[PDB]
Each structure stands twice: as structure tokens, then as C-alpha cells.
Amino acid sequence: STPSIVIASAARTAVGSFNGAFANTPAHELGATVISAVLERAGVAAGEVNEVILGQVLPAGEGQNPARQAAMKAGVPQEATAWGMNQLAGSGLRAVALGMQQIATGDASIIVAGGMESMSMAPHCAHLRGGVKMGDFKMIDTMIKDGLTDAFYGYHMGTTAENVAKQWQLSRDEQDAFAVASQNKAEAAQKDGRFKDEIVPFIVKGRKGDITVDADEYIRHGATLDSMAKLRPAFDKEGTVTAGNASGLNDGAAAALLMSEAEASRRGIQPLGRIVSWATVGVDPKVMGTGPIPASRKALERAGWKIGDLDLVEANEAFAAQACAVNKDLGWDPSIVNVNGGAIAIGHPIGASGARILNTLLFEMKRRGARKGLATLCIGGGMGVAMCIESL
Amino acid sequence: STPSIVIASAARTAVGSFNGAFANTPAHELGATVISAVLERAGVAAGEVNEVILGQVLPAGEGQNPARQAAMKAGVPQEATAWGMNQLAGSGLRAVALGMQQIATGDASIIVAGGMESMSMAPHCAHLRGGVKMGDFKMIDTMIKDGLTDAFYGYHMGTTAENVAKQWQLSRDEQDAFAVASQNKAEAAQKDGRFKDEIVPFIVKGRKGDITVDADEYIRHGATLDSMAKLRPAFDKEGTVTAGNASGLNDGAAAALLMSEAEASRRGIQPLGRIVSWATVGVDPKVMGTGPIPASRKALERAGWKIGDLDLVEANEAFAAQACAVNKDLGWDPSIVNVNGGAIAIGHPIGASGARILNTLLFEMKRRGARKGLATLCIGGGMGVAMCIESL
Amino acid sequence: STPSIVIASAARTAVGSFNGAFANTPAHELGATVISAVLERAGVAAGEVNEVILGQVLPAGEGQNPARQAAMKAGVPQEATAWGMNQLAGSGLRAVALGMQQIATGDASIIVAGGMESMSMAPHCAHLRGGVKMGDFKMIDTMIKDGLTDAFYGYHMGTTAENVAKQWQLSRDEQDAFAVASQNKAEAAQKDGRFKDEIVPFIVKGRKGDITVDADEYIRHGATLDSMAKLRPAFDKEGTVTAGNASGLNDGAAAALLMSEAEASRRGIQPLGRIVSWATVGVDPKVMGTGPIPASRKALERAGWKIGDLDLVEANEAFAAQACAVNKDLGWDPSIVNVNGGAIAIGHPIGASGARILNTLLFEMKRRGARKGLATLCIGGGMGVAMCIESL
Amino acid sequence: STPSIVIASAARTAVGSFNGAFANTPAHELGATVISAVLERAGVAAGEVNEVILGQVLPAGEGQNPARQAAMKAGVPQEATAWGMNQLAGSGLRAVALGMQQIATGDASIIVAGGMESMSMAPHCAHLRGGVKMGDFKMIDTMIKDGLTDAFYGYHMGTTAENVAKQWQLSRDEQDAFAVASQNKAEAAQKDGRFKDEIVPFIVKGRKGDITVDADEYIRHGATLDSMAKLRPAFDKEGTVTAGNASGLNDGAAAALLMSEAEASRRGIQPLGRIVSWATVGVDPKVMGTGPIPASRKALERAGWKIGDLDLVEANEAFAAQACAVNKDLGWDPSIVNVNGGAIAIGHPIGASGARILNTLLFEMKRRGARKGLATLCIGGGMGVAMCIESL
């Protein structure tokens, strides 16, 4: 009689480009559309929700507890609760596991969990309370400081990617091929309509017109190898990691509605999947992109699955270098990984990404009739997170 | 059979005044000292820790995931994990409940949970990406915007307190009396040595000398009713809420180390208590200070306890108005509530407070041999969280 | 033996739109281009310049005495001197008068004088030395604060324009019909090449391509009365002044090479004119747009001239309201006023505008063979300035 | 015959220390007390003033034309005119020459001229119209950027003083000797009452106290060669210039009232002095402190004087190295130079400094009965200004 929790429904916004479609859209407005969507898609009313849990790395200047803001905007009643959390890129996936645990421990029946992020709306800051008697001082980009810079070594996440490139002897040609493939896979899936089911359209309100956004705008159409080859290294001058083989700076939100297996049955819901297991593990910050290796092995151990039992995998592509290292070590068939493309093409709204790649996994598992899936991401500061999903 | 999680050990720093002892100390440095302390106090080595979970409302400018920063500084190995979370004032207590759930679901054996906050070090900010083509703009105090302003009604938490004062007909004289009592209780507890056990001293590293902080600096000695009566209302010009009958802006951290009851017995630890129940519930943001009412009632229901069964209560004092409302409604003997004073005297380091009052409750239950306790806080945006503890 | 000073040569950059052509070009660079221009137009070498005087209203963040930076870039030797001044919109024509005085008093042989302005490059500022212990503070737009806001009445210069409109009972249709006439006059002069002689090209240095600017970008092509009548009142919500019948925010520079009449004759220079008189006078800041009325009448009195003796006038069109009032009062033939259009069309780079209109007058006076001319402008704070010029 | 222009009256505020006495006083409020005081000391009515001309280097944020703001607050009517100018530390003296020229050309009868400066009220700024798309940026100290950094070689003025000390072979013992002796002369003069006449008290409007300032606060009492010699270099790590032998950051205003000699005779005003000549010359920027050398020679040649003729001199001490070198090259008796101390002691309110020293020169010339005086300053960017005075 071990607790069994299902994902009844899921949805994500399109991922916007940096200072692009969602340039002036607070993360909680994206989150509120995603909440509304999961509820509609499951046939569950906002009144029934007990808690909303949203990963978010960059909430500065957005006001008190943006998760509660997103819940309230979506009509979740004042009697429910809401909170935010931060395990960097792991957050939007880890929030799902956190939601599962509220149900498993008997503290809630119905949870909406995911993540949301507006990198565009992240402010610049400075600690000014003591005062600057005289001289210049720095206004810090909170996106770079709080999101992308390692706190122990003082360098960008891209440098950890270089470290991984060096350790696994990953050529600039291998990384570029990977990146072009991600773009081409993503472009094909977009064109074929494979992101329609997962995406809920977002209405960006405007004085001189509302704009509906329902397409992933960061995916480059007709990306060429030559384009990638011409780029300068972004983080080391004799490096291999570029703006082209790294993911970008992006905005979006994504979520899942969770409840027990027996609850879904009473309601007659056909869930998108059952949460079979999850794990999170640390690694050295210097090679943080390696996190998915110990996390995915641990999740699989917990599920009682072999790597070869998986039918589909979403492994987040923060950088080609790390995505390549993860596939090499794990040895899973690359043909079942990121089948509709990855973050290099789609983008990386940090605190939402974990939920974004769960959406992609779940709606692809449904479409192809895949029985077993895994979602995993690397995490700045040296962690990984993984979740195993089975179809009902 | 139902998991049973204990609190093996706890510690807090002293609570620093705004721009006082800890004016330039990042929250994660406070956190690291508390993690070190819980480990030392339980006889558990840092290598044994699976995860650190730290509430924190105001991390802007602090760099990537200050929870991980705190853990690493404390010697928790890279293979462990760490994350932060934000349910505002509820955070440092909610983190404990969340850590108890990691154990209950079999994902972890040993958790360090609590919170940390440096309101002093919170920066000013502005979104500057799209530019400011023309016209003035605000550099926003993130402490006020993200910590203390209601996101729905646009006013400060102190206005919610006013809303509560009016609905419950709480006079200025009653609120001031409650405030002077909190000061006087805290001063007496301090002088008698009652905060020694819970406090771990913090070494503020300087250049012209190191300074050890082990006393709660915000407590006013010899606080007079006359000094309370002379202050002007701080949020409504015909109001009743003042700087004197509200808590303050403060820095500190606090934590507990958690493990199963069976694991404590194996190690021969005498735990500070067993987590018997917890709960979180929403209320209207306009009267957010009333959150402890439904949360405490729900926590008690889940424990199987009557209000009368409690021997000791820590009910956080964000404002005299709400504290007095909570006490009236619940009807618990005020002589068992906040016996060593509350936050009006001690301070309100937002994301650490829930774990700070847990520390106070635990060490006082131990001191006086009390069997059943309850800790509870109000939460901006209209929530409450409560936890029930029993002696072992 | 009265001194007699001539404008040997003159030149201006073209006028840039707010954040357009010259969006990132420092004032002194524009200034340097115009200094080189007047030197080379006169056939005078920069080593022969004694002193450069540049009006400039918004110099903040451009570093030490930008008049010295424009001089020194332009190849004026270190042994010369250089300074800036601020009589607001008066500055650029006042600087010409001040140079005339250096020559009349025996202190200099040869002056370059004019003004420069980059309203684009004006920063935002805040006083921050005390430092801000808590609370939002304002980042002040120095363009609006130091350029456009009355320091006595607190409101914009366009509010002083409403005051003049109401006094003189200037309707919305009379203001719009003057606005459209100014745009049409200017697109005609532009199309006919009448701005070629006065405009010196400016090269905007770039990474992906140098850009040559030699045409006024703020002039609207095909300006209709209907487009003008669609606009909303910009300053008073049931007012008459709009974005269409006021000038805008602009960048540019303008100067003149000044020397004694006898010096020009030595050097074979055929001067654009002789400065016959000038005057500056004050009025009420509330109706500063009336400024040109006493200053133009004082200048004419000093020249021993009657208003009917003028063949050409340049009267700056800060607002259609004040420009209509000045014309109405003085009663000069509107067919000789701003014949190539005015500032509503050309733009209003404040501290340069007085040298800008001086350029347009001198060159058209050469073109049609006019003998007698007058330039005048209003001045925030309640002043006017005027100059009379005669052809040689 | 030649126009003879006299200084009817002069007044100055005491000099304030950075963030001290006048820490939150706008410059124009200081300017207005000196304008009102020049009128009172002369017995001339404010209505009879044609124009106010004020030097000011650092007006960012202060509002439209602070010279006008000064003039209107002083009770000069709206009919008159006002403007500011910037030759950096030459401005306060240059504004006097400019007022002199207004009268010599016949465009005005009565002028108030000087300089004003609030270095304390000078803001931080950044250009943010285009926005900052990503990355950290600098908020610039306008006091440093616009007041004290060379636009050409990018270093502090205290490095151009280091350059004069390597060229003139000036030791660190020679510069300490000049700075002790300056404080001694200044402190002895202050307690002597020799500054009383020239100073006009300023009322700093508080809220819990009006405070009257009539003493130069920056002057240190009992200044020895030891605390001079115990400071480390300020601009070069192996350098000679220190906080002790540089002047400082300061606030203040100063002005003189100008009219013709014949007009002073009509008004029964016994003038402080007649202006006989002035001059401004440029020098290599790298060694700007040499300005006062060519500028005083020229002023002296225009007057038809020999250097031996001077019975008193004010040579501004911006630095000890620049001042010792001007005393070296010109060869005038050091006993008559800065006899009541100088700016190392007194302070250096940039745009007001030239008017400041003109005040001390004039009031001391009257006391001691000296006929021929000279005032001069070095200017950033490489200039000197100087004016020759003769008491009648």
C-alpha cells in the first residue's frame, strides 16, 4: 500500500527569447496561465487545489512570494497555500517531487507544481545601506550573479562546461554537431505540431494590441553547421564552448497537476503518468554538468529499472559539452534522448526548465505510447536531479 | 507503520539588529555556523548529512543558491544536496516540515533544516534591460518590496496588522502593554541565561578585530510603557500600530538536525523532540496575521490534541495586534505562550524566524520538562504554519 | 573707434532624433566636428584659435569641461583655453555674444563659439553619499530635471507654453496650423538643398560600419493638419499643446568662427556677417515663452533698427504656442520668419539651438542676399536672448 | 577713455567639509546668501542688478540653471538674467572677468559674479536610455568623473600633481612643509578674526535646530609635521602627494558685486578694488598645476606691472606640488602669498574657489593697506586664470 502519485495533467508556456516575447512579463503571469491550464486539462477546479509549489531562481523585485501571486491570479482560493523554491536548474523538476511528497505524507490531496522564470525581468542591484561616501560602485546583474555564476570558484556555468569538455575530451566539432542536431530536431517537432499539446498559449497584454504567443521563439530555423563553426569561444579564449553550443537566456513557466492514483481513478482522469521514483545527488561544482549521471543512476536504482528499460529520456541541454558527457557515461541509446530537441534550441528558463522537460517527456510518452521515461537536469553548484515516470 | 521523525539537535545565532552586529554578514555565513552547531550538538559529522534545506526570503546579490553556500562552508560534502525555499515568515519552520518529509518518504536519512536571513544585506534594485528612454525611475528596496509589502493590496504588512487591530477591537493600550511584556520577558530570559543553550556564538570577522556575538541585540532593556505610548503610529495616521508594538528588521539563522526516531536511538542521541504534526493554511491577505489560527487548529487536529493539552507555545509576534488576536481566538493560557519573550523584543529575521522560535520552544520544553509544544507563525500573503512537538 | 566683430564662418552638425542617429555620440564629438568645420571653412588653422566657448545644458557624466574635450579633439592646441556655459536654450547664441566680448575687450583675436547637446547621452542620477538605510529612492533623469523642468513652479516647460497659449488666446487649430507650416517649410528647404551649406557631415564610428549623417532626421515628411489634430494634449489633459505642436528632444552642435572685421579682410575671408547687437532680458518663468519679445526689441533698439528694417528672422519654435505669440506681438511679416522651417521640425538640442538657428539665418541671408537679420529664442526660468546681424 | 570696472563689494560663505556642515545644502542656496550679502554690503538694491554670473562645475540634479535659482531666492527680480559657466577651478574667478566685460561693453551696469559649489550634493549617475541588456555596470561618481578626473589621460588631478613633483624635483618633506605652514597661517588667521569681514554666516535650516555656520570647518587646529608625515601616498603607491598636502572636497559660495568706477562714485560706495587686467592661458594637461604661471605673467603684462610690484597674492593651493612650483617659477616673495593660509587648509570648493580666493585677497588688501594684488588658480585639463587688482 505504498503511496502512488500520478501526474494528471501538465502544461507549459512557449519559451521566450531573452528580452523577446515576454521581455516585460513577470514570471508569475506566466505561472498563472500554466496553473489555469493544468486545472482545465484535468477537469479540476481551482477550488480543489491545496497547494502551489513553483521553482524560481530570480524573483528579485517581483514582490512577496511570486508563487502565491501566480496562484491567486489563477483563482486558487486564499485558503490554499503557495511557496517558491530554489535548487537552480533543478527547481522546476524538484518542485514536482516536493509536491508528490505532500500527497504521499497525507498533507495534501491536490498539488500544482513546476517552475517559472523571467530572466528578462531580472533586475540589477547593489547593497547601498551603509552608503558610498565617495567613488564608483557596481550595479550587479542578478541574472548573472544569482543564476549563472558559481559561488565557490567565481566563474560562469560555461567554464564548468569547459572543464567537462576537457575531462571527457569533447571536441568543438562534436559539440557543434550536437547543437545543430538539437536545433534541427526542435525545428522538425515545431513544424510537425509536436509542441502544440504541451504548450498553452500566453496572451501578452499591450496598449496597442494583445499578442498571443504559442510558439517557442528561440528555436533557429535552418541552423547550419557553418554558422556554429564560425562562433568565437564564449568563456575561454582557447575554448570550445560558444553561444551556439550553449543554451540561452529565456523566459517561461511550466507545471503539472498531481494527485494520488486512486484520486485520479475516482475522477475518471487518464493521467499522463505515475511518478515511480526521483533522486537528487551532488557532484563537484567544477563539473556540475555531470550531475545527471549519479542522479539518473540513483533514480533508476530506486525504481528498480535498468538503463536499457527506458523508452524515452529528456536530459536537459545546458551546454553541448555536458549533454554529451552525460550520454557517454550513461550509454543510453541517443535516439531515445531529446527526440524533439533540447534546451540548446528551445532555451533554458532556469527555474522552469525542469518542469519544461517533464512536459516534453510526458506529452511525447503519450503520443508514442512509451511505457518508461526519465527526466534529468544538471544544477549549478554541483548537483543533479532525476525522475522516473511510467505510463498507466 | 507510520514514520516518526525527531529533532536530534537545534541551534540559532543571536538575532542582530538592522545594520547592527551582522550589518555586513551574508546570510549564508550565519547559516554555516548554525549547520556546524547542529552537527556538533548531535554528535553527527558533516559527512553524514544528506540535504540542507534553508528558508530565505531575501537572497538577491548573494550568488547562486546560498543554501549550498552555507552547506559547503560548513563542511557538508559535495555529494549532499541543498536548496532554499520561501514561504515568507513561514519559511524557517516550513523547511523543518519539508525535511521531515524527505525522511518520511525514504529519500534521506539525515537533514539539516531551518532558515537564514540578512535583511541588512538586502540590496536595492531596478530592472534596467529595456532601458529608461526618459523619465525618473525607482531604485527599489528589495527588503520592503519582496519582504514586507503585500503583493495584492500594495500596502505594508503593518497595514494588515491595522486591519486586524480594527476587526478585533484591539486598543493602542492593549498592544502597547503586550509589547512592553514581550520586552520585559525577553530581558529577564536573557539575563537569567535562558537563551545561552539555544544560541551558538557567531564570530564577525573584521580587519581591526574579530567580534564574537552571542547576545540578542534587539532586546531593549528597561523598556517603559511611557516610551511605547509616545510613539506615533507608523502605518496609518489615525492608527494603533507603531515601531514599538511591531517587530523589527533583523538578521540571523536557525536550524534543526532531523533523523528518524529509530536512527537517534541507534546513535544514542536524546532528541529535543518528536515531530507529531504540522499544517499550513491560507487566510485573506488583508488579515494575514490571523494565519496562526487555522494553522494551529489544523496542526492540533492532525496530532489528536486539544488546545488544553499544550504545555508550551511559541506564537511569533510580527505585530502586537495579530499576536493578541491569535491568543484571543485560540484561548490558550497566555502564561504558557512566549514565556521568554517574542519577536517584538527579539527581532524578526523573516526567513529564519520560524526556525528561531522552534529553537526557543525546544530548549524551553527541555528546561521545564514540558511534554507537548506548538510553534506557529503568520505569513505575508495570507497564510499560517504550525508544528506540534512532543518530548521523548 | 568701435571694435566691430564678424562671423567669419559657421557650421552645424545636422540635428539628430532622440536616441536615433547620435544616440550614443558624446556632445564633445559633435562639438569637435563643428569646430574643425568652421576652421576649415574660414581657411584658419586650429593653432590660431585663442579660446573655444560652448553652451551646454546637460554635461553630466561626460567628464571634465567637455568644451576642452571638443577643442582638443578638433586639434586646437593645449595653449588655448576652453569653457562651457549654461543659459539653457539661450546658451548657444549667448556663447557667440560672449566670444564677441572677448574680442571687443582685447582679450582674444579669434574665438570659436556655439553650443553642443546630446540629450540622448544625459544620464540618470541620485544623491547617494549618506547612503540609503531603507526605502526606494529616485533615479532622476537629468534631461528632464536640469533641462525641461521649471525650478520655481515644478512643472515642465510645456506647462509654461500652456500659460502663454491661454494669455494670448491661441487655439489648438492655430497651434497645429503653425506646426504643419513649420514641417512643410522644412521638408521643402531639405528637398531643395538649403541645409547643405550649413550642415557639416558627422561620421558615427561603428563596429559593423561607419555611418555618415548629413540630413535632419527629425523633420517629418508630408505632415498633414489631420495627423496633427489626432494628437492628445501632452501636458494639460484638456490643454492645447501636444507632441506635434512642440519641438522634441534632440542632439546636435553648432558654432561660429568670430574675429575682428579687419582680421577677416587681412585673410581674404568674406564673412557671413557683422554682429551689430545683442540683448538678454528676463520675464516671469511661468510665461518664459514671451522672452523673445523684450530681448528682440532691446536688440533692435541697440542696433538703432526698426522691426520693419529686418529682411530675415530666426525665432526659435520651442512651442507653437509661444512662437505664435512672439510673432503676433512683434508683428514682423511671418513670410520672413523661419523661412526654412523651425524647431518643431528641425529639433531642439537645447544648448546648441541658439547657434543652430544662427547658422540657418546666416546661410539663408547669404542665399537670398538679405542685409539685416535677427535671431532670438526663449529661455526656461523666464529669459530671452537676441542678436542682430548685417551682411557685409 | 578705457572702461574702469570696480568691485564694489564681496562676500563668501565659510568653507564646509565634505558631507559636513552643508552636506545637504544645494549650491544655489549658498549662492543666494552671497548674492544677497554683496547687495547689503554695498547698499545696492537687488532690483538694480542686471545679471548674475556664477561658476559651477557640478550642477547635476540641481534643476534648471542654478545661477537663476540663486538669483531669484536672493530677491533679484525676474527682469534680470542669470547663467552658469564652467572653467573648472578657474570658474569663480573667470565669472568675475566675464561680469567685468559685460560692463566694459555696455550691455549691463551692475553684475553679481562669483562661483558656488556643492561637492557633497553631487550625485552618482549612469546613462541607461538604451538600457543595459546584460552584465554589471558602473554608477559613476559625478564629483570625481566631472570634477577631478582628466578627460584625456584618465587619471585623478592628484596624479598631475605627482607629474609636477617629478618635473620640479619636489620632495615629500618640501610638500609637508608647505601644508603645515598653510594650516598654521590659516588657523592663526581664523582665531585672529581675519576671516570675519569676508565671511557671511549661512543658516542651515534643520528641523530639530537651525544652525548658523560662520567658521571654516575644514581648517585643522595644531597641525604638526608628524601626522602630515605619517600619511601614505594618495595617488601613486611610491608617490609624494597625500590627503595632507592636497586640498580637499568642500562646499561653498562666493561672489563680488561689479559696476563701473564712476557708478560707484555716484553711489557713495568705497570700492574694495579696481580690476586692471586678467588673463587665461593653457598648458599641457598632464601638468595642469602650472596654469597659474603663464596666466599671471599674461595678466601682469596686460596690467603693465612687474612681478616685484605685487604687495599681496592669492595662489590657489589645489595641491602642494603645484603651488610650490608656481612659487618657484614666478619668484614672488612667499611671505605675501596666501598670508591667511590657503585651500590645503581652507578647502577647495571647485567652481567657487576662484571667487573664494578673490575674497580673501580683497579683504586682506584693505586690512594691511596694500595697493596691488593678484589672484590665480590652476585649472584641470591644463589652464590658468589670473586677475590683477588695485585698491583705490
JSON list of C-alpha atoms in Angstrom, two decimals, chain D residues 287-352:
[
{"chain": "D", "resi": 287, "resn": "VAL", "atom": "CA", "xyz": [50.89, 69.12, -15.71]},
{"chain": "D", "resi": 288, "resn": "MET", "atom": "CA", "xyz": [47.82, 71.35, -15.20]},
{"chain": "D", "resi": 289, "resn": "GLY", "atom": "CA", "xyz": [49.03, 72.84, -11.91]},
{"chain": "D", "resi": 290, "resn": "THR", "atom": "CA", "xyz": [51.40, 75.03, -13.96]},
{"chain": "D", "resi": 291, "resn": "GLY", "atom": "CA", "xyz": [48.43, 77.03, -15.21]},
{"chain": "D", "resi": 292, "resn": "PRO", "atom": "CA", "xyz": [48.95, 79.98, -12.86]},
{"chain": "D", "resi": 293, "resn": "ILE", "atom": "CA", "xyz": [52.44, 80.58, -14.30]},
{"chain": "D", "resi": 294, "resn": "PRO", "atom": "CA", "xyz": [51.61, 81.75, -17.88]},
{"chain": "D", "resi": 295, "resn": "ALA", "atom": "CA", "xyz": [48.23, 83.16, -16.71]},
{"chain": "D", "resi": 296, "resn": "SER", "atom": "CA", "xyz": [49.77, 85.51, -14.10]},
{"chain": "D", "resi": 297, "resn": "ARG", "atom": "CA", "xyz": [52.61, 86.59, -16.42]},
{"chain": "D", "resi": 298, "resn": "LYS", "atom": "CA", "xyz": [49.99, 87.50, -19.08]},
{"chain": "D", "resi": 299, "resn": "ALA", "atom": "CA", "xyz": [47.69, 89.23, -16.56]},
{"chain": "D", "resi": 300, "resn": "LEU", "atom": "CA", "xyz": [50.77, 91.11, -15.31]},
{"chain": "D", "resi": 301, "resn": "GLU", "atom": "CA", "xyz": [51.87, 92.11, -18.84]},
{"chain": "D", "resi": 302, "resn": "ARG", "atom": "CA", "xyz": [48.35, 93.31, -19.68]},
{"chain": "D", "resi": 303, "resn": "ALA", "atom": "CA", "xyz": [48.39, 95.43, -16.49]},
{"chain": "D", "resi": 304, "resn": "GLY", "atom": "CA", "xyz": [51.87, 96.81, -17.30]},
{"chain": "D", "resi": 305, "resn": "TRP", "atom": "CA", "xyz": [53.23, 95.61, -13.96]},
{"chain": "D", "resi": 306, "resn": "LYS", "atom": "CA", "xyz": [56.47, 93.80, -12.97]},
{"chain": "D", "resi": 307, "resn": "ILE", "atom": "CA", "xyz": [56.16, 90.90, -10.51]},
{"chain": "D", "resi": 308, "resn": "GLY", "atom": "CA", "xyz": [58.09, 92.86, -7.86]},
{"chain": "D", "resi": 309, "resn": "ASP", "atom": "CA", "xyz": [55.19, 95.38, -7.73]},
{"chain": "D", "resi": 310, "resn": "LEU", "atom": "CA", "xyz": [52.78, 92.94, -6.08]},
{"chain": "D", "resi": 311, "resn": "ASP", "atom": "CA", "xyz": [52.35, 93.50, -2.30]},
{"chain": "D", "resi": 312, "resn": "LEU", "atom": "CA", "xyz": [49.85, 90.60, -1.93]},
{"chain": "D", "resi": 313, "resn": "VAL", "atom": "CA", "xyz": [48.99, 87.39, -3.83]},
{"chain": "D", "resi": 314, "resn": "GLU", "atom": "CA", "xyz": [46.47, 84.59, -3.60]},
{"chain": "D", "resi": 315, "resn": "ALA", "atom": "CA", "xyz": [47.69, 81.50, -5.41]},
{"chain": "D", "resi": 316, "resn": "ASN", "atom": "CA", "xyz": [45.15, 78.63, -5.04]},
{"chain": "D", "resi": 317, "resn": "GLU", "atom": "CA", "xyz": [46.69, 75.56, -3.38]},
{"chain": "D", "resi": 318, "resn": "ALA", "atom": "CA", "xyz": [44.84, 72.71, -5.07]},
{"chain": "D", "resi": 319, "resn": "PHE", "atom": "CA", "xyz": [47.97, 70.67, -4.32]},
{"chain": "D", "resi": 320, "resn": "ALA", "atom": "CA", "xyz": [51.27, 71.30, -2.51]},
{"chain": "D", "resi": 321, "resn": "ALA", "atom": "CA", "xyz": [53.29, 70.22, -5.50]},
{"chain": "D", "resi": 322, "resn": "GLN", "atom": "CA", "xyz": [51.59, 72.56, -7.97]},
{"chain": "D", "resi": 323, "resn": "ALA", "atom": "CA", "xyz": [51.72, 75.53, -5.58]},
{"chain": "D", "resi": 324, "resn": "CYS", "atom": "CA", "xyz": [55.41, 75.09, -4.56]},
{"chain": "D", "resi": 325, "resn": "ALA", "atom": "CA", "xyz": [56.28, 75.09, -8.30]},
{"chain": "D", "resi": 326, "resn": "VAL", "atom": "CA", "xyz": [54.38, 78.30, -9.14]},
{"chain": "D", "resi": 327, "resn": "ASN", "atom": "CA", "xyz": [56.13, 79.96, -6.19]},
{"chain": "D", "resi": 328, "resn": "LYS", "atom": "CA", "xyz": [59.35, 78.53, -7.68]},
{"chain": "D", "resi": 329, "resn": "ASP", "atom": "CA", "xyz": [58.96, 79.79, -11.27]},
{"chain": "D", "resi": 330, "resn": "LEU", "atom": "CA", "xyz": [57.41, 83.24, -10.70]},
{"chain": "D", "resi": 331, "resn": "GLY", "atom": "CA", "xyz": [59.81, 84.07, -7.86]},
{"chain": "D", "resi": 332, "resn": "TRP", "atom": "CA", "xyz": [57.47, 86.29, -5.81]},
{"chain": "D", "resi": 333, "resn": "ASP", "atom": "CA", "xyz": [58.13, 86.69, -2.08]},
{"chain": "D", "resi": 334, "resn": "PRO", "atom": "CA", "xyz": [56.47, 83.69, -0.37]},
{"chain": "D", "resi": 335, "resn": "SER", "atom": "CA", "xyz": [55.64, 85.97, 2.64]},
{"chain": "D", "resi": 336, "resn": "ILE", "atom": "CA", "xyz": [52.88, 87.76, 0.64]},
{"chain": "D", "resi": 337, "resn": "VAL", "atom": "CA", "xyz": [51.38, 84.56, -0.83]},
{"chain": "D", "resi": 338, "resn": "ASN", "atom": "CA", "xyz": [48.32, 83.07, 0.90]},
{"chain": "D", "resi": 339, "resn": "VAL", "atom": "CA", "xyz": [49.13, 85.08, 4.06]},
{"chain": "D", "resi": 340, "resn": "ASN", "atom": "CA", "xyz": [45.95, 83.86, 5.78]},
{"chain": "D", "resi": 341, "resn": "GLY", "atom": "CA", "xyz": [46.66, 80.29, 4.64]},
{"chain": "D", "resi": 342, "resn": "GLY", "atom": "CA", "xyz": [45.25, 78.55, 1.57]},
{"chain": "D", "resi": 343, "resn": "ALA", "atom": "CA", "xyz": [42.98, 75.75, 0.21]},
{"chain": "D", "resi": 344, "resn": "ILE", "atom": "CA", "xyz": [45.02, 72.88, 1.70]},
{"chain": "D", "resi": 345, "resn": "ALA", "atom": "CA", "xyz": [43.76, 74.37, 5.00]},
{"chain": "D", "resi": 346, "resn": "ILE", "atom": "CA", "xyz": [40.70, 76.35, 3.89]},
{"chain": "D", "resi": 347, "resn": "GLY", "atom": "CA", "xyz": [39.30, 73.78, 1.38]},
{"chain": "D", "resi": 348, "resn": "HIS", "atom": "CA", "xyz": [38.65, 73.67, -2.37]},
{"chain": "D", "resi": 349, "resn": "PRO", "atom": "CA", "xyz": [35.03, 74.19, -3.44]},
{"chain": "D", "resi": 350, "resn": "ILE", "atom": "CA", "xyz": [35.83, 73.75, -7.16]},
{"chain": "D", "resi": 351, "resn": "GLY", "atom": "CA", "xyz": [33.68, 76.26, -9.07]},
{"chain": "D", "resi": 352, "resn": "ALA", "atom": "CA", "xyz": [33.60, 78.66, -6.08]}
]
